[PDB]
């Protein structure tokens, strides 16, 4: 039942996207606000290498099978870094209540969103190739660096990327919902 499916998926993605923003802000005001960590962030996401549409036109031109697969690949690629973000922050002695709190929600909801997404692909495109191929994140050494400024800059890159990518998943899902269910007459 596509309509309820897409509605659940979009409820999730919009929630996650909003949480990502609030998290990146709350980290930024508290830790980084005065300093040029914003400049270290220039093209440093583990998912940069993926071909993602960057404007509406590019979005419309994509075919819907590849587009769904894309969303799935991005979500899969985030399960590793969100696990370590949580483990690291939770393992601090004095863990900032706000941030950790959001981080845990994003982690859990993201699992659920990927379940709904995988289920969408099953209804809409049942004869797809069962093949994982998503970018690999391997930034844990940096999140664990003893140099504090280097450490903060790792975390900043990461939250900046999480915010971008969740906003992106959300937008793309909204787009596909209108396309698949409403022939782009939402």
């Amino acid at each position: 039942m596509l309509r309820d499916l897409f509605d659940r998926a979009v409820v999730l993605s919009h929630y996650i996207a909003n949480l990502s923003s609030e998290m990146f802000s709350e980290f930024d005001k508290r830790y980084t606000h005065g300093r040029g960590f914003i400049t270290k962030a220039i093209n440093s996401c583990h998912t940069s290498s993926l071909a993602t549409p960057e404007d509406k036109e590019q979005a419309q031109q994509m075919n819907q099978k590849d587009f769904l697969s894309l969303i799935v690949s991005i979500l899969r690629s985030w399960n590793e870094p969100l696990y370590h973000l949580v483990t690291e922050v939770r393992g601090m002695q004095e863990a900032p209540e706000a941030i950790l709190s959001k981080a845990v929600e994003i982690e859990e909801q993201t699992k659920r969103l990927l379940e709904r997404m995988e289920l969408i692909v099953s209804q809409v495109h049942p004869e797809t190739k069962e093949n994982e191929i998503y970018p690999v994140w391997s930034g844990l050494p940096s999140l664990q660096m003893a140099d504090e400024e280097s450490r903060l800059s790792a975390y900043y890159n990461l939250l900046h990327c999480l915010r971008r990518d969740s906003h992106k998943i959300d937008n793309y899902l909204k787009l596909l919902k209108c396309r698949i269910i409403h022939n782009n007459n939402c």
Binding site: I42, H167, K168, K174, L175, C178, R179, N184
Partner: protein, 206 residues
């Protein structure tokens, strides 16, 4: 005889996630600029570009049309002021279009009193999204707020309408006249300004 003060880009905005405009201001405490140049580059490119349109957003502004606008990609931009005496560069400004979206206000706000036999009568508010936003493809998602008040009341009544373009308000003082406005925000970004008021008379028999 004085070269220009340091200029500042003090606002960027996107009305619909397809184009955007940025505005700068001259530094007072330098000479008069006779020219400005906005240059920028994007994240993960080394090409330097010039502002593509200095006209559209009027005075001291750079406007990026569809073909120069993309999401999820940082713009690194700088403006300089020059005159015959020399020059001065603004601080670099980092901009991600995704986070500077503020829609124009919603359109065609109409209000009507509906009095039916069988149920409580009501106020019926209707409006339209701003032109220029693509809701129908799903590229843009809009949320609305209504406010209303009779003149001289201290506080506005606020009602979140979600994604609907119409709303029903059940409880109003008979005979009293209300001002109603509506604004909207995207899923990520800033509330628009409130629309102009429409005024409605609540008839005495309500």
């Amino acid at each position: 005889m004085l070269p220009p003060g340091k200029p500042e880009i003090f606002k960027c905005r996107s009305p619909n996630k397809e184009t955007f405009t940025c505005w700068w201001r001259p530094g007072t405490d330098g000479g008069l600029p006779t020219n400005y140049s906005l240059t920028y580059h994007r994240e993960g490119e080394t090409l330097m570009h010039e502002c593509p349109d200095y006209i559209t957003g009027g005075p001291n502004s750079c406007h990026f049309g569809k073909q120069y606008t993309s999401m999820w990609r940082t713009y690194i931009m700088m403006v300089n002021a020059t005159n015959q005496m020399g020059s001065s560069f603004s601080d670099e400004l980092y901009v991600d279009v995704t986070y500077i979206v503020q829609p124009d206000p919603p359109l065609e706000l109409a209000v009507e009193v509906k009095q039916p036999e069988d149920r409580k009568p009501y106020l019926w508010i209707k409006w339209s999204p701003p032109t220029l936003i693509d809701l129908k493809t799903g590229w843009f998602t809009l949320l609305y707020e209504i406010r209303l008040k009779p003149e001289k009341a201290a506080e506005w009544e606020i009602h979140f309408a979600g994604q609907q373009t119409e709303f029903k308000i059940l409880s109003l003082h008979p005979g009293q006249k209300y001002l109603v406005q509506v604004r909207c925000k995207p899923d990520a970004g800033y509330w628009s300004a409130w629309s102009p008021a429409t005024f409605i008379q609540i008839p005495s028999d309500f």
